[PDB]
Amino acid sequence: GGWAIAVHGGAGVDPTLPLERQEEAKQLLTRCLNLGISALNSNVPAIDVVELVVRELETDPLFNSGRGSALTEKGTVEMEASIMDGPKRRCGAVSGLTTVKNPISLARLVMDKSPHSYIAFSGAEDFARQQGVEVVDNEYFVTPDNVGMLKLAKEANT
Template identity: 40%
Template sequence: MKKTNLRNLAAVMVATVGIACTATPTAQEDRYVLVIHGGAGTIQKSDMTPEREQAYRATLEEALRTGHKLLQQGSSSLDAVEATIHVLEDSPLFNAGKGAVFTHDGHNELDASIMDGHSGQAGAIAGVRTVRHPISAARAVMEKTEHVLLSGAGADRFAAENGLEIVEPSYFHTPERWQSLQEVLKQDSLKATGNDSKFGTVGCVALDQKGRLAAGTSTGGMTNKRYGRVGDSPIIGAGTYANESVGVSCTGWGEFYIRHVVAHDVAALMAYKGLGVAEATEAVIAKVDKAGGDGGIIALDREGRMSMSFNTAGMYRGAITSSGEVIVGIYQ
């Protein structure tokens, strides 16, 4: 399988206003089948050691390969999204699962959502503390209940009763995230959550061999969050959305994504204005930017065209084609 660096994709990738990256495969049989993100924010190469950058790139590629293998075997887009996000949830590099940030009270509270574009079904969980893979809990809500969103202790109990892997809350404790909380607490302000400690959310969109799309998003939320705050990641239409035409996953300052129904807005622009996936994501991220928000969007349409749009200094991101050609990026 061939690996391609973003800098070598001039023929198929275009940088546009809003710091958007878009790509279209040259042939239908080699379309993009999986797109991921690992958060957006002030990500500067000058602040990254070579070792840490390589760790990010390696984990992003591992996640892509994991989902791609399932898709090549004929698995569903839902299976691919879930398995891909598992890899990112198990890495302390990202603000999801193992690498989740801490609340003001020193807890890790996890949110996730998943949506099946073919059936229109969706599931989500918010504020769980013991579920190793929140994305799997979100899928269980979708498939095993009549609900869309479960939260708090009830969601933890639901996950345990349905056989999902349960861990002690200490499993999510990582020294780096704990130190981030201490630094924010020194500022002694609710507004301290308005820094880049809120970034790191992970997401995935997949297109399977039957042409079905699915999208999922998982996060630890915002460092120093209080009062049971919930962001956009578990909100269908805000942080995650999929229909038969496009799948979308978002990362960034959740309040802005909720107010502007960002994930659904991408799909709406495509359906009602006839925009392509790149035009739609660029238009929506520009709207978020104008409102004062920041972050990014990944999207994949049913023809295998994908887009990665963000208005920050960087976004951990990657994509893979049906033939296994990988692109991974971090900076602008």
């Protein structure tokens, strides 16, 4: 065979999904898929392609990752991610990120540049800064829509 790629924006979709949001989601999926296809046609390695595509999915506020992440009960964002390169089964993962613009790229750096495969919370925030990645205030990741839903989730918890 030749190249193949899939992208996802999560399971658990409610069947009453508004058409308008269904269209936004397909348009985003298409954009991300095509971004990966473009890299694959340009002979970019698989490990670089999954990183570049998940970065786009992180940046767009629609799905639950990066900016647009679900909120904690405190109303803030704690993000996590993992990446794996198949040929030598190389792994990188991060949890508890609060300022890192693109969690998946920090997981990549754990894979390539740490003796460990998983770094989390304060140590992962330290590592991001040693590595010089883009970091921002947590409020950056928080969107009005998610504040709205957090409210609901809380009260629903009766």
